[PDB]
Amino acid sequence: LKKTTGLVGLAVCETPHERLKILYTKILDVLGQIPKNAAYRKYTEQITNEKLGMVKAEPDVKKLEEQLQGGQIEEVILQAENELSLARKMLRWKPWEPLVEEPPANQWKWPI
Amino acid sequence: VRTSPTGEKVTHTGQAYDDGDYRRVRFSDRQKEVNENFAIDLIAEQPVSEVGSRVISCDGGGGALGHPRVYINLDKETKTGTCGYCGLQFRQPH
Amino acid sequence: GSDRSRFLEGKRAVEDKNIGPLVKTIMTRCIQCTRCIRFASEIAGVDDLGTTGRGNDMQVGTYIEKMFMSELSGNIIDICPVGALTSKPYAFTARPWETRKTESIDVMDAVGSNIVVSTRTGEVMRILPRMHEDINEEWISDKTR
Amino acid sequence: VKPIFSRDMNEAKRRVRELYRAWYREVPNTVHLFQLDISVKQGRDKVREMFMKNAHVTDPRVVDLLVIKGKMELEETINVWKQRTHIMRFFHETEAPRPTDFLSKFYVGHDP
Amino acid sequence: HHALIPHGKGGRSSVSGIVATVFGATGFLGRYVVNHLGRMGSQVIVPYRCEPYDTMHLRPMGDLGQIIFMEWNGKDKDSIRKVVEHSNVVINLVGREWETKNFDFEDVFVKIPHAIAQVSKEAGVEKLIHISHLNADIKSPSRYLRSKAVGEKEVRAAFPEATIIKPSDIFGREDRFLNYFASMRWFGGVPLISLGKETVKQPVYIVDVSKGIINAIKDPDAKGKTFAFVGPNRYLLFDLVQYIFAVAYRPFLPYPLPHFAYRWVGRLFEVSPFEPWTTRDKVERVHMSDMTLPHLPGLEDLGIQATPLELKAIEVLRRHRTYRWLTSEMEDVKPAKTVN
Amino acid sequence: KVKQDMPPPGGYGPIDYKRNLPRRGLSGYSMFAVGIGTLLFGYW
Amino acid sequence: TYKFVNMREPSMDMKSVTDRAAQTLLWTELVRGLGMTLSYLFREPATINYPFEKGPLSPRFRGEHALRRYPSGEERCIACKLCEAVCPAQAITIEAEPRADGSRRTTRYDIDMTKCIYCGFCQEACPVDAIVEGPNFEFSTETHEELLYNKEKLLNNGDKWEAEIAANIQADYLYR
Amino acid sequence: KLDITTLTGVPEEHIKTRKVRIFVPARNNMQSGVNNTKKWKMEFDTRERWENPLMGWSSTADPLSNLVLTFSTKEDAVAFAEKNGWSFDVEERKVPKPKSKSYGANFSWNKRTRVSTK
Amino acid sequence: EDNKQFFGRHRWVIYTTEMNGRDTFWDVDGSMVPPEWHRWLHCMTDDP
Amino acid sequence: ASATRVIQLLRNWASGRDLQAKLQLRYQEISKRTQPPPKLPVGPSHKLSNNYYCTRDGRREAMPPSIVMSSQKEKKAVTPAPPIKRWELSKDQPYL
Amino acid sequence: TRPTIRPRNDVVHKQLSAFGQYVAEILPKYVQQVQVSCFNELEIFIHPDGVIPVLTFLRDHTNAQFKSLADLTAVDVPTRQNRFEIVYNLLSLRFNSRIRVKTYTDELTPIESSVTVYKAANWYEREIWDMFGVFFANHPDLRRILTDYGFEGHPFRKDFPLSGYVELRYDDEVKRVVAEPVELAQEFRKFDLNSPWEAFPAYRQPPE
Amino acid sequence: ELSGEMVRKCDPHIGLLHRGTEKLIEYKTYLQALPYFDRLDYVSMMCNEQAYSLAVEKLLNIQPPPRAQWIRVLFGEITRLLNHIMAVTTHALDIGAMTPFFWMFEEREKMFEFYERVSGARMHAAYIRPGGVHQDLPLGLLDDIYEFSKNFSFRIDELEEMLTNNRIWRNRTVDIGVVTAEDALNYGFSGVMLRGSGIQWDLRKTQPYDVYDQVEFDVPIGSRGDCYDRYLCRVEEMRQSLRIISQCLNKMPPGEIKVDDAKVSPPKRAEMKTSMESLIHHFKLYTEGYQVPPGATYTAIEAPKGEFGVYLVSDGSSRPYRCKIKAPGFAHLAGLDKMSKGHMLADVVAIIGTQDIVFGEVDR
Ligand SMILES: NC(=O)C1=CN([C@@H]2O[C@H](COP(=O)(O)OP(=O)(O)OC[C@H]3O[C@@H](n4cnc5c(N)ncnc54)[C@H](OP(=O)(O)O)[C@@H]3O)[C@@H](O)[C@H]2O)C=CC1
């Protein structure tokens, strides 16, 4: 059990595997509500399922951190929480819908 | 360095304050800074070099410490060739 | 062009020609484009400027001490790609980047030639022709210039 | 067009009246705190003049942005962020009167 | 000969066309005159007889080169000739309310101005502006005003086309008129001859006087004319002093004093080697009521409307207030009774 | 021959770049002993 | 790649505890700092006796601008105005006219020493070496106008400092 | 009807009394290059410039003396001028008219185009 | 010159008591140093 | 320095270091102010052949940005770059 | 070989292009165009409505963890109807990559504040409002930074003259620092430096 | 807003040193704009010059010569030593130490002498320019730098002796200004502000710019995110900069100091005075400047005070269309309010010291 994560404000998680499992399952639950053909859902599910499979397969925190390549496992849980919040806000925003409006005629022309 | 009628020292540029001009007050208890050495007179004083070639090169002296190298045609007998930068004059002998 | 010179020999020099009181001539800068000759022949109508000699010694200018006099003589200063032919009145007065250009019309004649009045620090420095295909193609008279 | 704060001119007029109320009540406090030598009536007249300068605006968004700028200026004055110099700059005391009749402009200078 | 075309929009960098030599510019009126000249863009030549430190406050008043400081001596005419040589305008503001060992009232108000006017006429200066108190008269009790009248006569003699401006007490931040009354608080009660009921004064704002001088320089008609500068309202000395103390929020304790006792007190303060707090001449001039001279043109002729004392009193007298009354507004004190 | 400002052949000598705060002073027991001995002699 | 400042744990043995207790009660570390200050007291001071002693400067120093001349005495300036063009602060005002000899010389050359940033440009830019920032640094003035230099003032500075300016240019001309 | 004049902060005198010229800058006749004739330019009216008494430097009081703006098209510059409430004058672009060039004409048998010298 | 003293104090100048008609016994200034000795004094050159 | 031996000992003991070995003030160790003239080398492009500027023109080799996607006309998830590798504690001094 | 010219790294180019396509696919609603510069920099062009959504997506790990707002700024191009181009520069420390998201606005059209997403945009958006005229809606405190307390115009706007419209001096008459119309003693000398000849043929715009 | 001496609200008012640098750059050529960057952060001039040079070179698609790059890295590390000396000593002086300031400012004077010898300006030299460095090192400078570096470690050690373990100094800084790593990242903090909190990010290693890939140094990382930890980080960074300086001294390459392209870097004076092409290019470069291919770039470096960035947009002309400077101090001063919560006035002074704010950068 690591004494400190090393980054101020981030505390060592006593039960990392359980927390990661719960967070990934919740992220998948939120993704389910999102339309099937939305790219966000497909990519996020792909990433989540890989992460959850890795978490379940490996019982050692250090080996899991090496496999995930997301930094210390506490940082991984923090990223999972961030993803969950994004997924929840995504549902409201509905980014998968077509472009709101095309830009003016020469709004991105440079040199002028 | 000639002196103007007002008593001011005319500059090499020829600048001197007319009696009408009010700007002469700036030197009332101070002085007008004029360089006594005049470039035109000193350049005139230099002797004219006589070279036996139709075209000669002037670098201003000192090589890289002078001015860009230029080649001067000396064919005209009437007038000496003058360096655009240095101001030195050259002429073919005879 | 390249950024360096491989020329390791002496450069040529040309004796300057006097063609009048308006055009200052430094012929060593000439690149023998022949623009001045063709202009004098075709537009001005004065066949007094030409090339004398052959090879690298070829030189542009009246063989004799003739003076190029015409209403449109000053335009050779504009036409010349290099500073071989330059305005004597405007010599050494200013550099191109300093000048502020104002587009205006000439009043010396009723032709209405379009001109660019070049001013620096509130002082008129030169008059340059402005292109109006209908009135003045690219030329202005000596009086306007 | 997307409204800045008001969808129609009447709402912007309401906001403008609220801002005018705020300035009108603030004027005496400004004279007291900044130790200005102007009278309260003089400052309130200056406030009216500043409001009247932009009385020609007919677009709701421009009026809303003007109200925002006025609120920022009022915040500056309510605090002491603006000094007596800034407060008295509205009164162009140092600047000399500039004649507006044609003959006076003709006499004074080349300005149109 | 020394004529310059005006150029610019009237700013700091513009050329007004006015080249001036402001004698006595290191003083209450000189500061404002120089500031007004500099803001237009005029060239101001300042003759200074004091240390250069005292002239430092005038240095920022003009753009680069506009303000030229040249040391001058009133007794020496050659310094006057040097200062006024290249000026198209000369303004004489040299006056000391207290006589000094080296220079008495005669020298400061008669000899100096006469020398200035004569040297200006010799030099060719187009215009000259001279300042003499409105109450100036050859029969006045005060030596100051008597010398002022004699100097006015001499200046008109030397310079026939000279504008002479006769100003009343000029109230301002650096004034010795309002500050003089306010400073009397330190001595307890305010000594007044006859309690001030018999004296009437018409103070003038300093900015109005300076603007009048500048407009007189600008005005072509001003040549060879005597203007009287007076404030909008005339006040009894008692009412004016009471208003001064009210705006200063300092207790007012007027006590009548006999004229001879006040003169003796003035003699006591004259003893000071440094600048005297008060002089017998100061007492006489304060007691003397301001003359009314309808014949002479005034500020209205020059285009400036006189600012009332009420508007500008707080500027001068706020500093004299204590901490309790420092922040009080101008409107709290009602205007004093006006004898008009 | 080219002459630029170049490192001396073989390079410069090593430059120390680490903290060298020294270890100084007596042990705490000794300092307390000295203080107490001074106190006792003063008391006597 | 990364190092841990702090991140050290004190020993809990009785000797180390007693040492730290002595440090707290007997103020050892403050005494160490006092000793360092005393050692500095006994070290030689670094103050130089200005004005009598002057700080080191190199030949590439950038100080007061100066207008140089050729050995003949002709002014090096050929009114290129490229040195005006490269001035980052637009501190150089140049006007030129053909002189009586017919040469391209400057009727007006002004450097505002109050708008100048002493960048060192126009010494690199000027083609003929005419304008040079010389060694002088002690040219403080009591008035703003004194610092608005004129062609006469610049030429006088060049004449005054030519002996040093030439030697410094000789020293650094190969590096340029 | 867009008006940003109140929001710009420009003083009224420059807003009302200034005429802005919308034009394609003409080619400098000294040079044959045409790259500097490809974009519209907005330039304000010239105003007084006077000599500084101390040094003779040209002094100005016109805040917009050096202000020049580049616009891809004439309409955009006009829109900017209208939004900022400046009176505008638009000079139509001048394009070199197509010319017929023949080197053979220099040696014509019967025409006057024959060149005396090459 | 005292080369033993550390750099910055090895070279020093004792200003003259009279220069260009000014009494400089007490009032001395850096500008009094002539240009030729300026480079030696300021260490731009090692040769006097 | 010129310090006497007693002062040198006192300062060294107070500091806890040998101050004489490393002295802040600068002595004859500094480089001579006058130096032999340099001969700066030329760069790669100083050649008399095969040096055409077209080959070595960097600016003209710049190109307008490539447009990956434009609105106006399974796949593996991707990242902006491969994830950063964790840093390794320094061997010389892992803990200060 | 080719010492003068900058070396090119295609690997980073391909990675950035792939991630740009990734972003375009995930948020087609807002992204309008994504381009990768040949110096290996990625730009995603977004509709003004998508600032908060796209930035929140970028910060949160949908394989992107741009959790640092390098800088926020605007570029005023008067020609375009939306004269202001809001530019966001983000840094992802997890993937050691940086991407740029750009949007447009007008003088009268507000853009949503990003203080919620990043919290470093408070002062950046205040600076954008102060210099340029953009108003950011829902900002915690929008006020002037870097300009004088009474400053009226919005500098950096390509209409504002470099010297401004007002100048400050101390006036003895009012015993106060007083503003006045600008009157330069030496007018800034405008230099026309652009050459008449084209320098880069690659960027030659179509004749039209 | 202080209840007693406790700061309820800290509101930073800036712009007292706003000189309109970015607006002025638009009116200047790229070379003319270079001196501006020296002034932005007075303490760390050469690093800002390097950042601008890197941005302009990336837009230009030109590569600085290797010796120029090594000179840039060396003088950048010297500038880092100067900047950290100033920051630490001025922080101590504000918290009352007042002796290390003089002690270290003597060494700052020596490093200024190195600056003067290279450029002729003690500070604000234009040495680092797009395309390389203006002039080659004067002969003998490297050995003098070695002489300085061999002894600088003792000075840093004496400063540590004065401050590192002092009870008073630790009390003034041990737990003041704590910033969480996530808060530090979100608030835009860079450099020691991030690394003090424990985040491992140094652009010199993560994204090397000039030759830092070829040098070995250790990034100092903190554990408590406090003022004391950041001070320790800055001291260790000074020591690591000394390590990098030794490495740069030993492996300085021979050759040119500016790109051998006369359309970007000016030709040598002799060549300009002897060759027509060189004269033409010198004339154009010093009058028009070099046109930069149209584009935009954000180039950042690990400056002594954090990440320094320039968002440079080019319209293809000789003058930049827009130049936006990302100053590390801007975000740190923005976060000052969050850091100050729960502290007293002296703690606020210490926190201002910790973030090493030079207001030329902040106001620009
Ligand atoms: N209420 C008023 O102010 C009135 C004004 N006036 C006249 O107008 C002027 C107003 O000046 P005021 O506001 O009173 O301020 P001051 O009393 O300071 O005016 C005197 C000025 O002249 C200088 N001066 C004084 N005595 C001499 C001397 N003997 N020789 C040379 N210079 C001298 C002073 O400089 P320094 O200190 O160095 O001597 C100062 O600049 C005076 O001449 C006054 O008589 C007339 C009527 C009323």
Ligand code: SF4
């Ligand atoms: S136009 Fe000029 S370059 Fe061409 S031939 Fe005539 S003089 Fe020579």
Ligand code: SF4
């Ligand atoms: S600038 Fe052009 S015309 Fe003048 S000398 Fe050089 S190449 Fe010839």
Ligand code: SF4
């Ligand atoms: S080098 Fe100096 S003197 Fe010569 S042309 Fe250039 S600016 Fe003028």
Ligand code: SF4
């Ligand atoms: S050194 Fe002086 S004159 Fe030369 S560019 Fe810099 S500021 Fe201008």
